[PDB]
Amino acid sequence: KVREMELIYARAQLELEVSKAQQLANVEAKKFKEMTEALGPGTIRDLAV
Amino acid sequence: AVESTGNAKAEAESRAEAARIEGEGSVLQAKLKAQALAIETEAELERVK
Numbered sequence: 472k473v474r475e476m477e478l479i480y481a482r483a484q485l486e487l488e489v490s491k492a493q494q495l496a497n498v499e500a501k502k503f504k505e506m507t508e509a510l511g512p513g514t515i516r517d518l519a520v
Numbered sequence: 521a522v523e524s525t526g527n528a529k530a531e532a533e534s535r536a537e538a539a540r541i542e543g544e545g546s547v548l549q550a551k552l553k554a555q556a557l558a559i560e561t562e563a564e565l566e567r568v569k
Contacts, residue, residue, distance in 0.1 A: 476565060476569060
């Protein structure tokens, strides 16, 4: 019973974990895309040029 | 022969005769302990849940 309850509990906390991590990954990627498009996609290539 | 062997036999027989009693008592106490751990971990399981 304890391994079972701990199993479903950990399953919940873990799916919640990958969920929130996926969310922060989403806002991060979206923010970075909005910034890089705000700056100019070819301008950074000039910066590395 | 009958005296010495009879004495040692009665003595060891008394030993086993006791040991079977504390053994069976250990069994019944093991059962009560089983119920105790059962209901305890069960009621506690609602709390952790």
